[PDB]
Amino acid sequence: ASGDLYEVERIVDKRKNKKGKWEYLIRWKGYGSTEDTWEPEHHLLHCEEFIDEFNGL
Amino acid sequence: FALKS
Protein backbone atom coordinates (compact mmCIF):
# COMPACT_ATOMS: atom_id res chain seq x y z
CA ALA A 1 0.00 0.00 0.00
CA SER A 2 1.12 3.61 -0.77
CA GLY A 3 2.00 6.16 1.91
CA ASP A 4 -0.78 8.77 2.44
CA LEU A 5 -1.13 11.78 0.09
CA TYR A 6 0.23 14.92 1.86
CA GLU A 7 0.13 18.53 0.69
CA VAL A 8 3.39 19.93 -0.80
CA GLU A 9 4.83 23.36 0.19
CA ARG A 10 7.81 23.34 -2.23
CA ILE A 11 10.62 21.22 -3.74
CA VAL A 12 13.96 21.67 -1.86
CA ASP A 13 16.26 19.61 -4.13
CA LYS A 14 16.30 16.99 -6.89
CA ARG A 15 18.46 14.02 -7.95
CA LYS A 16 18.36 11.23 -10.55
CA ASN A 17 17.60 7.62 -9.51
CA LYS A 18 19.62 4.70 -11.06
CA LYS A 19 17.00 4.53 -13.93
CA GLY A 20 17.59 8.24 -14.89
CA LYS A 21 14.25 9.56 -13.41
CA TRP A 22 13.99 12.58 -11.06
CA GLU A 23 13.42 12.24 -7.30
CA TYR A 24 12.43 15.39 -5.35
CA LEU A 25 13.20 16.39 -1.77
CA ILE A 26 9.72 17.57 -0.64
CA ARG A 27 9.01 20.28 1.95
CA TRP A 28 5.55 19.19 3.22
CA LYS A 29 3.01 21.97 4.00
CA GLY A 30 2.83 22.55 7.79
CA TYR A 31 6.22 20.82 8.33
CA GLY A 32 9.89 21.92 8.23
CA SER A 33 13.32 20.63 7.15
CA THR A 34 13.21 17.76 9.75
CA GLU A 35 10.19 16.19 7.95
CA ASP A 36 11.51 16.58 4.31
CA THR A 37 11.50 13.28 2.34
CA TRP A 38 12.94 12.19 -1.02
CA GLU A 39 10.03 11.16 -3.30
CA PRO A 40 10.13 9.67 -6.79
CA GLU A 41 8.53 11.90 -9.48
CA HIS A 42 5.70 9.29 -9.97
CA HIS A 43 4.57 10.06 -6.36
CA LEU A 44 3.61 13.66 -7.41
CA LEU A 45 0.00 14.54 -8.35
CA HIS A 46 -0.27 17.71 -10.54
CA CYS A 47 2.94 19.16 -8.98
CA GLU A 48 4.30 20.67 -12.28
CA GLU A 49 4.12 24.25 -10.78
CA PHE A 50 6.46 23.16 -7.92
CA ILE A 51 8.91 21.46 -10.37
CA ASP A 52 8.87 24.56 -12.65
CA GLU A 53 9.35 26.95 -9.67
CA PHE A 54 12.32 24.86 -8.45
CA ASN A 55 13.95 24.67 -11.94
CA GLY A 56 13.40 28.41 -12.52
CA LEU A 57 13.52 30.23 -15.82
CA PHE B 1 -0.30 16.61 -3.26
CA ALA B 2 2.19 13.75 -3.30
CA LEU B 3 2.55 10.27 -1.89
CA LYS B 4 4.82 10.47 1.17
CA SER B 5 6.99 7.39 1.69
Resolution of the experimental structure, in angstroms: 1.5
Angle formed at CA A18 by CA A16 and CA A35, multiple of 5 degrees: 55
Q: Which long-range contacts (CB under 8 A, 24 or more apart) does A47-50 make?
A: A47/A8, A47/A11, A47/B1, A47/B2, A50/A8, A50/A10, A50/A11, A50/A24
Q: Coil, strand or helix: which one is A16?
A: strand
Which residues of A fall below an 8 Å CB-CB distance to B?
A: 2-8, 26, 28, 37, 39, 43-47
Determination technique for this entry: X-ray
Domains and CATH numbers, chain A: 1-57 (2.40.50.40)
Q: Do A43 and B2 touch (CB under 8 A)?
A: yes
Q: Which long-range contacts (CB under 8 A, 24 or more apart) does A28-31 make?
A: A28/B4
